[PDB]
Structure formats: structure tokens, C-alpha cells
């Protein structure tokens, strides 16, 4: 059994053949096509060249599990408005799709197959997330389960002041860009410069970690997960992870109200997390998990 | 089949015989006893006088479903630190207990047996809650599921600024008490006086509803329930319910970020909500639901 596993994003399309244990057997990618018709022909070319038992996909936007339709909006607009169950029917394979942040959450089941209740917070330009409840994805009435970036941790005012706005890597970058006066920054450089003495980076980091810690304690007391995994590029840096944990410890010690602290850990995967999670989504929906 | 149903609180102990459809067949109460030994003898007297098939209980504090022990702290301290499975073993009946705010959430299943995913926010002196996920109570790793009163909607500072502090009936009362200069207030009087022209009451109400609306949109975007039910004494007033909904509509219209609005409704029950919910908890744990 091989699963044709597909990650569609603005940054490119990946196609990989995975085993049911989650081993990548081969991996290829192209630049995002200009039109649906060029993507379907690429996908036809990849699918045609092994005997696949299933097609699993990580996509941006909100999937309707009943129709195969991806709603909402994303960086790849031509993927929306039709049934992928129909678009791929001719392979006569079971097809499942799932939203990318949910995929990242499910990839943790491969790494930690004993997880029952878990939250995953994917930190990028904004903040997306996922919930697992008794070993399964929790999607919610309107597929909005685990949209932790919508959480307002300040009173809305001129701006919504949702978590994505206050606590994301993109918004830490946007803040150092505004005060440094130039745009040659990313999260990883902010870290090097703070380590080198750079005061404004030190402070960008402290605000970031403190806003994350406030929002992570909310998640802990609202859904009470066994663990919260942090994903996205920045969670791949152990200095970020240690800084967030210390920031959480500091809230807990300061407010007598707090008893339990969340268990926090970096996501296991990142670069291929959507492949692994789209795989694990396929296996669960087909009940081979 | 009759279930001996018990609600233990600081305000008194209720004992009622319920049918499995949720009909109260008889209902009695006493003042909270001064000691465990007087409560167990009262309970023995009530239990002795019909043929019960089960014992269902609503209790304050955190229940350990495996041990029957109620942890934490409450207004009735002598109920903590022992197994109620042991304390009641001699009746040789199935015994289940559940925390009171969770009970209130489960009472909604009696009123609305089709609920799959639901949040319940119990508004009193503070804010407690419950989550239902696929028709069952979600308790979480540390029985903290649905402790929505712990959610911080402002940055912590001198005070934690958790939802219970900013949005509860008790804290609306505490605010009118502080500015009116006297203590002859409750939520229901605040409403009459605001209706009569009283400006400070009008404002207490507006702050209350606006803080509730902010926190209710968080719940909607974080767990994405089909409905949020509001319980506690104040939710029994239709003017409060209408004011909260309008306050939510006003956030939605103001922030382009918001698409879906929560469906909000008053809890069906209040005065006997713990009895009904403790009943429904019993039936689910015994798989007769
Ligand atoms: O998993 C979707 C996938 O399965 C196929 C057949 O292998 O279609 C089946 O599933 C669809 C979704 O419910 C049905 O509408 C269809 O009629 C059924 O045969 C493929 O056509 C499709 O890509
Ligand atoms: O943690 C994985 C999570 O992050 C994203 C966005 O960063 O990963 C995508 O973009 C990356 C570019 O930095 C790639 O390395 C990665 O392979 C790609 O999927 C989300 O798409 C993903 O859900
Ligand atoms: O690899 C670390 C680092 O590089 C980034 C830069 O955007 O992503 C690149 O490398 C990934 C491998 O980790 C690829 O999947 C991706 O396509 C590539 O752009 C970061 O996301 C990551 O932090
Ligand atoms: O539901 C608890 C209740 O059941 C009884 C027997 O009717 O005890 C059973 O359940 C306990 C909880 O697991 C066991 O420890 C016990 O050994 C078993 O017989 C009552 O004793 C108890 O109140
Ligand atoms: O909505 C029910 C919820 O409210 C409480 C606290 O108000 O109800 C208890 O106290 C009331 C006094 O106003 C009583 O009317 C009610 O019968 C009693 O249980 C919580 O205990 C309950 O969970
Ligand atoms: O009944 C409405 C109103 O009265 C209060 C006052 O505290 O509770 C009393 O009445 C209840 C019946 O609704 C009883 O269960 C309770 O014991 C009694 O004190 C409020 O809770 C409620 O809003």
C-alpha cells in the first residue's frame, strides 16, 4: 500500500509517496501552476506512475468533508469552488483532504500515537491551529475548530487585537521592520541579533513569548489538552521553545489563580508536516489507523 | 426505574427522585449540614424510602471519575478527600457524580437531545462552563474542560483579568455596589433600575454584555460549538439574553475578521438544572442514554 500524498500551498505543490507508517518513499515538487488545468495535468502525471491505494491532500482553506469542496479563500484561488472527489474520480481511489493546520496537528499522531487530547498552535505569519479530542480531529459545526488565531487577548479597539495579530512570527517581524527602519529581517535573524546584544530584537522576542504564553494558558484552561504542540518554522528553534515555556512559568508563578501549567513541546515535523498529517487524516477517515 | 438524584451546594442539599426521561417525581431539600456524618444520615433516610435504581449527584469541585473523590475546594469542605463510591457502597447501586457546571451543560441534552457540539457558560458570582463534543461531556486531562472563566480577555496586570472577573453577574453587582456606595443590589435590581433611568446600572449592564460578547466569540472561534447556552440566574432574564446577542452582533459588524456569529440561547433549566444534568450524566455513564 502506497498513498499518493499532496501538499498544495502558495509556495509550491509537493507530491510524495508515503507508506501507512509514514515513511516518505519519494518526494517531488513544482512551483504553484498558474491554473487548475496545469495542476490537474501535473497531478495526473505523478499519479500515473505508481500503483497508489489512496490520495491524501493538505490544502489551504476550509474543506467540506461531504462534498470535497474547499471553501473560503487562499493563495491558490483556482483550487476553490468544486469537488475534488469529482476532479479525481477517474483514479477510482479513496480521496481525503484536510486543511493544512489540521494536518500539522494530525502529524503529531505519527510522532506520538498515544495522544488523546492535544492542541496544536501553528505559528507563522498568523496563527492557525487544530484540536485532537479522543485521538481524532475536532472540526466543529463550521470547520472552525482550533482557530486559536481568532482569540482576542486584549479588548478589541481600532484593531481586533486577535492572537494572530499579537503573537505571530509575522507580527514580530513586522514590528522589528517598523522600528529598525528596514525590511531585511526574519524570525531567525531576529534571534541572532538579540543574541548579539540587539535590544529591539530582545524586546520583539519578549513581547512575542509573553503574548503566546497568555494565549497558551487560555487554551489549557479552556479545552484542557494533555499537551500543546507548537508548529511552524519558529517552533523548530529550541531557544524559542525554551523562551515560551519560561514565559508561561512566569504567569503561573505570578497568578495564584493558575495551578496546572500546559505541557508545551515543539512539533516533530515542519517541512513535511502537511504530508504526514494529510496521510494520517487519510488513514483515520478510512479506519486503517 | 427511579434515580435518586442529589444536588450538594453551599445553599442547601436537594434530593429528588427522577425518571430516566427527566421527570421530577418528588423533590425535597435541607439546609447544608454541619458535618459529613449528618449529611450521610440524611441521605440514608431519603434513600431508604423508595426502591432506587441508581444514585446521581451534582457536586461542587473536581470529580475523579475513577476514584469517586472530589478534589479541590468548595463551600462544603467535608465532602472532599474520600471516595463517594465507598461512602455509598452499601446501597449497591451505580453511583455517578459530576461537577455542577458540567451538570448544567448536560441538562441541555434533556431539553435538546440532538446537540452534538455545545458550550455552556454558567454565569453567577464567577463564570464556569462545560463542553459537549459529539453528544458527550468533554472533561479534559485534568477535569478542566470548559473552565471558560479562566480566559484572560485583557492583558494580566495587577489582576489576572480573567473572564470571571470581568464578565460575571457578581462582578457587575460588585461594581454597582462600589459606585452606588451601598450593598442593596443584585442582578435583577440592576436591571429594574437601568430600565427606570438609572445611568450607573445602564453602564454596568453595557460593560457586562460587551465583555461577555468578546469572550463568547472566542469560544465560537476556538471550539466552534453548534450553540452556546447561557445558564445561571441572570440567563433566566430575556432582556439579558437579548442584550448579549445584540452585543455580539455589534462586534461581528465592526470587525471584518468575524464571519459566523455564535448561536446563543438561554439555558432551559436553572433552579433544577443540577438535578437534570446529574441525571443525564448518570444515564450516559451507564449507557442508558
Ligand atoms: O473518495 C472519493 C473517491 O471515491 C470514488 C470511487 O473510488 O467515488 C466514491 O466516493 C464519492 C464520495 O462520496 C461518491 O460520490 C462516488 O459516487 C463513490 O463512487 C471516486 O470517484 C472519488 O474520487
Ligand atoms: O509547520 C508546518 C506549517 O508551516 C507551513 C508554512 O510555513 O509550511 C509550509 O511552508 C514552509 C515554508 O517555510 C515549508 O517548509 C513547508 O514544507 C510548507 O508546507 C504550512 O504550510 C504548514 O502547515
Ligand atoms: O529549513 C529551515 C528553514 O528554511 C525555510 C525558509 O523559508 O524553508 C525552506 O526549507 C524547507 C526545509 O525545512 C522546505 O520545505 C521549504 O520549501 C524551504 O522554502 C523555513 O520554513 C525553515 O524554517
Ligand atoms: O458505582 C459505584 C457503586 O457500585 C458498587 C456496587 O454496586 O461498587 C462497584 O463499583 C465500584 C467502583 O468501581 C467498585 O470499586 C466496586 O468494587 C464495585 O462492586 C458500589 O459499591 C458503589 O457505590
Ligand atoms: O444555572 C444553575 C447553576 O446556578 C447555581 C448557582 O446559582 O444554582 C444553584 O443555586 C441557585 C440559587 O440561586 C438555586 O436556585 C439552584 O437550585 C442551585 O442549584 C449552580 O449551583 C447551578 O449549577
Ligand atoms: O426563582 C428566581 C430567582 O430566585 C433565586 C434567588 O436566589 O433563587 C431562589 O429560587 C429558586 C427557584 O428559581 C430556588 O431553587 C432557590 O433555592 C432559591 O434560593 C435566584 O437564583 C433566581 O434567579
Q: How many CB atoms lie within 10 A of CB B89?
A: 12
CA distance B162 to B218: 13
Cell (9 digits) for A117: 487530547
Q: State which residues form the domain around B51.
A: 2-98
**A12 Cα nearest atom in ligand 3:** 17
Q: Is B133 helix (H, G, I), strand (E, B) or coil?
A: strand
Contact residues on chain B for A226, CB-CB shorter than 8 A? 141
**B272 Cα nearest atom in ligand 6:** 15
Best of A160, A221, A228 to mutate (most B CBs within 10 Å, chain B): A221
Phi, psi of B111 (to 5 degrees): -65, -35
Q: Which of B47, B68, B98 is the last residue of a domain?
A: B98
Residues A16, A158 share a domain: no
- The rounded Å distance from CA B8 to ligand 4 centre is 21
Query: C-alpha B258: how far from its chain's center?
Result: 28
Sign of the CA dihedral running A191, A193, A198, A204: negative
Residues B126, B158 share a domain: yes
Q: Which of B98, B128, B157 is the last residue of a domain?
A: B98
Residues A120, A195 share a domain: yes
Nearest to B225 among A141, A221, A257 (CB): A141
Nearest to A117 by CA among B283, B118, B280, B137: B137
Residues B129, B26 share a domain: no
Evaluate whether A115 touches A227 at the Cβ level (below 8 Å): yes
Note the resolution in Å, 1 decimal.
2.0
Q: How many CB atoms lie within 10 A of CB B270?
A: 17
CA distance B190 to B234: 11
Judged by CB atoms closer than 8 Å, whether chains meet at B220 and A144 is answered as yes
Rounded to the nearest angstrom, the minimum Cα separation between A258 and chain B is: 9
| Exposure on the CB side of residue A37, measured as CA atoms within 13 A | 0
Evaluate whether A96 touches A56 at the Cβ level (below 8 Å): yes
Evaluate whether A81 touches A67 at the Cβ level (below 8 Å): no
Cell (9 digits) for B126: 464567577
- CA–CA distances in Å: residue A135 to residues A57, B152, B219: 20, 28, 21
- The rounded Å distance from CA B106 to ligand 4 centre is 23
Please tell me which residue of chain A has the smallest CA distance to B253.
A160
DSSP calls for B54-117: EEEEEESSEE-TTT-BEES--SSGGGSSSBHHHHTGGG---EEEEEHHHHHHHHHHHH-TT-SS
DSSP B148: G
Residues B47, B134 share a domain: no
Ligand 3, atom 9: closest residue by C-alpha: A271
Residues B176, B89 share a domain: no
- The rounded Å distance from CA A52 to ligand 1 centre is 15
Q: How many CB atoms lie within 10 A of CB B1?
A: 11
CA distance A40 to A50: 17
The residues in A 235-274 lying below 8 A from B, measured between CB atoms, are 251, 254-255, 257, 260
Q: Which structural technique was applied?
A: X-ray
Residues A197, A228 share a domain: yes
Q: Which distant-in-sequence residues (6+ apart) come within 8 Å of A131 by Cβ?
A: A105, A117, A118, A119, A120, A137, A138, A145, A146, A223, A225, B223
Residues A61, A138 share a domain: no
Q: Which distant-in-sequence residues (6+ apart) come within 8 Å of B251 by Cβ?
A: A156, B213, B214, B217, B258
Cell (9 digits) for A62: 476550509
Q: Which distant-in-sequence residues (6+ apart) come within 8 Å of A66 by Cβ?
A: none
Q: Which distant-in-sequence residues (6+ apart) come within 8 Å of B182 by Cβ?
A: none
CA distance B16 to B7: 9
Judged by CB atoms closer than 8 Å, whether chains meet at B140 and A214 is answered as no
Residues A167, A64 share a domain: no
Q: How many CB atoms lie within 10 A of CB B63?
A: 23
DSSP B150: G
Phi, psi of B268 (to 5 degrees): -70, -40
Rounded to the nearest angstrom, the minimum Cα separation between A197 and chain B is: 28
The residues in A 71-130 lying below 8 A from B, measured between CB atoms, are 117
Q: What total of structural domains would you count in chain A?
A: 2
Q: Degrees (nearest 5) of the Cα angle B102, B213, A253?
A: 65
Residue B7 is part of a domain; what is its CATH number?
3.30.420.40
Nearest to B202 by CA among B215, B193, B189, B214: B193
Evaluate whether B269 touches B111 at the Cβ level (below 8 Å): yes
Evaluate whether A108 touches A130 at the Cβ level (below 8 Å): no
With helix as H, strand as E and coil as C, how does chain A read?
A: CCEEEEEEECCEEEEEEECCCCCEEEEEEECCCCCHHHHHHHHHHHHCCCCCCEEEEEECCEECCCCCEEECCCCCHHHCCCEHHHHCHHHCCCEEEEEHHHHHHHHHHHHCCCCCCEEEEEECCCEEEEEEECCEEECCCCCCCCCHHHCECCCCCCCCCEHHHHHCHHHHHHHHHHHHCCCCCCHHHHHHHHHCCCHHHHHHHHHHHHHHHHHHHHHHHHHCCCEEEEECHHHHCHHHHHHHHHHHHHHHHHCCCCCCCCCEEECCCCCCHHHHHHHHHHHHHCCCC
Query: C-alpha A100: how far from its chain's center?
Result: 6
Contact residues on chain B for A222, CB-CB shorter than 8 A? 146-148, 150-151, 219, 222-223
Sign of the CA dihedral running B189, B190, B195, B198: positive
Q: Which distant-in-sequence residues (6+ apart) come within 8 Å of B246 by Cβ?
A: B209
Residues B286, B154 share a domain: yes
Cell (9 digits) for B200: 450607573
Judged by CB atoms closer than 8 Å, whether chains meet at B152 and A254 is answered as no
Residues A34, A157 share a domain: no
Judged by CB atoms closer than 8 Å, whether chains meet at B221 and A151 is answered as yes
CB contact burial A161-187 (16+ within 10 A = b; e otherwise): bbbbbbbbbbbbbebbeeebeeeebbb
Residues B247, B165 share a domain: yes
Q: Which of A53, A72, A98 is the last residue of a domain?
A: A98
Contact residues on chain A for B144, CB-CB shorter than 8 A? 220-221, 224, 260
Nearest to A152 among B144, B160, B218 (CB): B218
Instruction: Determine whether the shortest distance from the Cβ of A136 to ligand 2 is under 6 A.
Output: no
Does the CB of A180 have a partner CB in chain B at under 8 Å? no
Evaluate whether A247 touches A216 at the Cβ level (below 8 Å): no
- CA–CA distances in Å: residue B14 to residues B11, B17, B23, B46: 10, 10, 15, 10
Amino acid at each position: 500500500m502506497t498513498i499518493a500524498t499532496i501538499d498544495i500551498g502558495g509556495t509550491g505543490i509537493k507530491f510524495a509517496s508515503l507508506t501507512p507508517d509514514g515513511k516518505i518513499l519519494d518526494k517531488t515538487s513544482i512551483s504553484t501552476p498558474e491554473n487548475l488545468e496545469d495542476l490537474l495535468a501535473w497531478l495526473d502525471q505523478r499519479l500515473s506512475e505508481q500503483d497508489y491505494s489512496g490520495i491524501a491532500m493538505s490544502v489551504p482553506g476550509a474543506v467540506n468533508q461531504e462534498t470535497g469542496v474547499i471553501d473560503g479563500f487562499s493563495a491558490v484561488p483556482y483550487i476553490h469552488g468544486f469537488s475534488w472527489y469529482e476532479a479525481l474520480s477517474s483514479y477510482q481511489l479513496p480521496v481525503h483532504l484536510e486543511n493544512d493546520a489540521n494536518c500539522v496537528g494530525l502529524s503529531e499522531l505519527l510522532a506520538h500515537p498515544e495522544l488523546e487530547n492535544a492542541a496544536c498552535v501553528v505559528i507563522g505569519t498568523g496563527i492557525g491551529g487544530a484540536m485532537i479530542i479522543n485521538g481524532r480531529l475536532h472540526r466543529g459545526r463550521h470547520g472552525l475548530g482550533g482557530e486559536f488565531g481568532y482569540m482576542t487577548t486584549l479588548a478589541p479597539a481600532e484593531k481586533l487585537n486577535n492572537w494572530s495579530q499579537l503573537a505571530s512570527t509575522g507580527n514580530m517581524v513586522r514590528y522589528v521592520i517598523e522600528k529598525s527602519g528596514h525590511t531585511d529581517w526574519d524570525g531567525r535573524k531576529i534571534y541572532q541579533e538579540a543574541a548579539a546584544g540587539n535590544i529591539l530584537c530582545q524586546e520583539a522576542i519578549e513581547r512575542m513569548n509573553r503574548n503566546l504564553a497568555q494565549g497558551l494558558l487560555n487554551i489549557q484552561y479552556l479545552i484542557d489538552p494533555g499537551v500543546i504542540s507548537l508548529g511552524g518554522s519558529i517552533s523548530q528553534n529550541p531557544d524559542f521553545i525554551q523562551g515560551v515555556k519560561k514565559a508561561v512559568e512566569d504567569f503561573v508563578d505570578a497568578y495564584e489563580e493558575y495551578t496546572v501549567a500546559p505541557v508545551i513541546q515543539a512539533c516533530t515535523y515542519h517541512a513535511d508536516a502537511n504530508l504526514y498529517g494529510a496521510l494520517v487524516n487519510w488513514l483515520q477517515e478510512e479506519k486503517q489507523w
